[PDB]
Amino acid sequence: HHHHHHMVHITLDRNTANSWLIISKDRRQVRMGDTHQNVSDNKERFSNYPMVLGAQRFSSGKMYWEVDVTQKEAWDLGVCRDSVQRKGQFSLSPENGFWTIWLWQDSYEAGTSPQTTLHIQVPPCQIGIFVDYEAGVVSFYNITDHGSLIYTFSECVFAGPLRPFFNVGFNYSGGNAAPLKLCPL
């Protein structure tokens, strides 16, 4: 892919974060805390899962960013509608306004309904996410493996502004404490 020149500077929006997340001062890193992080509740916060949105909203054009997933056992990454449900249980699917991939229990899967098996030969330490709003495209690239394609959602019905989407995952095992990091341009 030659998508790097659509690079955008993504920062995390503290106000959307699950109350157990810790977002770094520079708003470029997020990790699961050991407890509630002493913030007030609000209608923006994801209640049931360790999720947070980027601050940026996209309604046109081509956008690209990269995320470091080094040493994590579980995570979800991609984009979602600004209007996604925040409270209670829900599945990550395009019908619910999410275009995502994830790692769970040693397998990679795309957030279709039902979910799709990914075929990755080189476990990625960094993921590239490309959105073409007009084309209706969300693509994922394996930066560790020379930028190889992971998955393309096409014919996407965004149906509103999009936000970068993150899930640091649970840490029940004690092996998933590591942060998600937005990598420099």
Q: Does 90 bind ligand VW4 (CB under 6 A)?
A: no
Which CB atom, from 37 or from 96, has the smaller least distance to ligand VW4?
37
> What are 21's two structure tokens?
């997340």
Taking CA atoms, 73 is separated from 60, 70, 121, in Å, by 33, 9, 17
Q: Does 104 bind ligand VW4 (CB under 6 A)?
A: no
Residues 10-69 that bind ligand VW4 (CB under 6 A): 18, 20, 32, 49-50
Which CB atom, from 88 or from 114, has the smaller least distance to ligand VW4?
88
Contact in structure between 89 and 46 (CB atoms under 8 Å): no
Which CB atom, from 54 or from 169, has the smaller least distance to ligand VW4?
169
CA count, 13 A, side-chain hemisphere, 180:
34
Instruction: Name the burial class of residue 165, with classes exposed (0-12), middle (13-18) and buried (19+) by CB atoms within 10 angstroms of its CB.
Output: buried
Q: Does 106 bind ligand VW4 (CB under 6 A)?
A: no
Q: Which residues bind ligand VW4 (CB under 6 A)?
A: 18, 20, 32, 49-50, 170-172
